[PDB]
C-alpha cells in the first residue's frame, strides 16, 4: 500500500535534543530495507539535512531531501536535483543593502558552508549550529557568495526584524516571500514554496500517487503535506490544527512518535 514516508525534522524526526533516537534510526533503516523510500523535508538548507540523511543511510535507498521547504528536490543516492526554486539574483543585493542599512546580519549558503560578514553574531551562529555547518566569513558578501541562492536569512532581535520584514514584504512583492521561522530569523525565499507542491512534483517523477504516501509532521508548515498525503500523521506534540487535519496522531517526538507510527501503520 504505502511506498513513501515523508518526515519533517524539528519536532518530528528529531527529539528535543535535536538528535535522531536509536529507535527512530533503526526503524527507518529497516523500513527502507523493506523497500519503502524516505523523504526528509525541512526549511533547512540542504547541508543541514545531509547529516541526518547519512545517519539514516538514505544514500543507499534512493532517499530524497526536500531542502528549503521543497525549494530543492535532491535524490540523495544519485545526487540528481529534480527541482530548483531559488531567489531571483536581482533581489540579493537588495536584501544585503536592507540588512546593512538596518545594522543586521545577513547570511546565505554555499554547499556545506554558511556565508556571512558577521560570524560573531550569536544569531548567525545559531543557524550554523542548528545545521551543523561551518561559517565562511567574508568582508564582501555580494562578491563571495555563489549565485543563485535558494534563500537568505536576515537575523537579529525580533523587534528589529519586524520592520525589515514589513519593508521587504512590499518592496519585493512579486519577487520574494518573507516570514519569520524563529522570532530572530527572517526568511527570504522565492514565491511558490510549499512542501506539498514539491511532493506533488516528486510523486509525478517517480510514478506514485498521494494515496501511497505517509507524511509526518508537527508544525503549521507541515499542514499542506499532512493534508496531501494519503496517510497524514500528526506528532503528539503537533499544533491542534495539524492534529485535526491528520489521519493519525502518534506519540510525541521525544516518545519516538515517528517509529511508533511506522510500526503501527505497517
Taking the least distance from each CB to Na ion, the nearer of 8 and 187 is 8
Tell the smallest beta-carbon distance from residue 12 to Na ion (Å): 5
Query: 222: annotated binding-site residue?
Result: yes
Report whether 10 belongs to an annotated binding site. Answer: yes
Which residue, 218 or 256, has its beta carbon nearer to Na ion? 218
Least Å distance, CB 14 to Na ion, is 9
Residue nearest to Na ion (CB): 11
CB of 13 to Na ion, least distance (A): 9
Residue 81 gets the label, from left (phi > 0), alpha (psi -120 to 50) or beta, of beta
C-alpha distances out from residue 182 to 36, 127, 189, Å? 33, 10, 15
Which is closer to Na ion, CB of 117 or CB of 218?
A: 218
Consult the annotation and say whether 8 binds a ligand: yes
Q: Measuring CA to CA, how many Å separate 256 from each of 90, 138, 168, 235?
A: 44, 41, 40, 10
Beta carbon of residue 8, minimum distance to Na ion (angstroms, whole number): 4
- Give the nearer residue to Na ion in terms of CB position, either 110 or 194: 194
218 annotated binding-site participant: yes
Beta carbons of 39 and 62 less than 8 angstroms apart: no
Between the alpha carbon of residue 140 and those of residues 96, 102, 137, 143, the distances in Å are 11, 17, 9, 6
> What sign for the dihedral angle of Cα 46, 51, 55, 61?
positive
CB of 42 to Na ion, least distance (A): 7
Residues in the site for Na ion, rule: CB under 5 A? 8, 10-11, 218-219
Measured from the CB atom, is 118 or 253 closer to Na ion?
253
Question: What burial letters (b/e) apply to 13-30, b meaning 16+ CB within 10 Å?
Answer: bbbeeeebbeebbebbbe
Residues at the binding site for Mg(2+) are 8, 10, 218, 222
Amino acid at each position: 500500500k504505502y511506498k513513501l514516508i515523508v518526515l519533517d525534522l524539528d519536532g518530528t524526526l528529531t527529539n528535543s535534543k535535536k538528535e535522531i533516537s536509536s529507535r527512530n534510526r533503526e526503524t527507518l533503516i529497516r523500513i527502507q530495507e523493506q523497500g519503502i523510500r524516505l523523504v526528509l523535508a525541512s526549511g533547512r538548507p540542504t547541508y543541514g539535512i545531509v547529516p541526518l540523511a547519512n545517519e539514516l543511510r538514505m544514500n543507499e535507498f534512493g532517499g530524497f531531501i526536500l531542502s528549503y521547504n521543497g525549494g530543492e528536490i535532491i535524490n540523495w543516492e544519485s545526487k540528481e536535483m529534480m527541482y530548483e526554486n531559488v531567489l531571483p539574483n536581482e533581489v540579493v543585493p537588495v536584501l544585503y543593502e536592507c540588512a546593512r542599512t538596518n545594522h543586521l546580519s545577513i547570511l546565505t549558503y554555499d554547499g556545506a558552508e554558511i556565508v556571512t560578514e558577521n560570524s560573531l553574531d550569536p544569531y548567525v551562529q545559531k543557524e550554523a549550529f542548528l545545521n551543523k555547518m561551518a561559517i565562511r566569513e567574508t568582508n564582501d558578501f555580494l562578491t563571495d557568495i555563489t549565485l543563485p541562492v535558494a534563500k537568505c536569512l536576515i537575523v537579529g532581535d525580533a523587534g528589529k526584524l519586524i520592520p525589515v520584514e514589513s519593508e521587504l514584504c512590499i518592496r519585493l512583492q512579486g519577487k520574494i516571500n518573507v516570514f519569520r521561522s524563529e522570532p530572530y530569523f527572517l526568511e527570504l525565499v522565492p514565491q511558490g514554496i510549499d512542501k506539498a507542491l514539491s511532493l506533488s512534483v516528486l510523486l509525478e517523477n517517480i510514478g506514485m500517487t498521494r494515496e501511497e504516501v505517509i507524511a509526518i509532521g508537527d508544525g503549521y508548515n507541515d499542514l499542506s503535506m499532512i493534508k496531501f498525503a494519503g496517510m497524514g500523521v500528526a506528532m503528539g506534540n503537533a499544533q491542534e490544527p495539524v492534529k485535526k487535519a491528520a489521519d493519525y496522531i502518534t506519540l510525541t517526538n521525544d516518545e519516538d512518535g515517528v517509529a511508533e507510527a511506522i510500526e503501527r501503520i505497517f
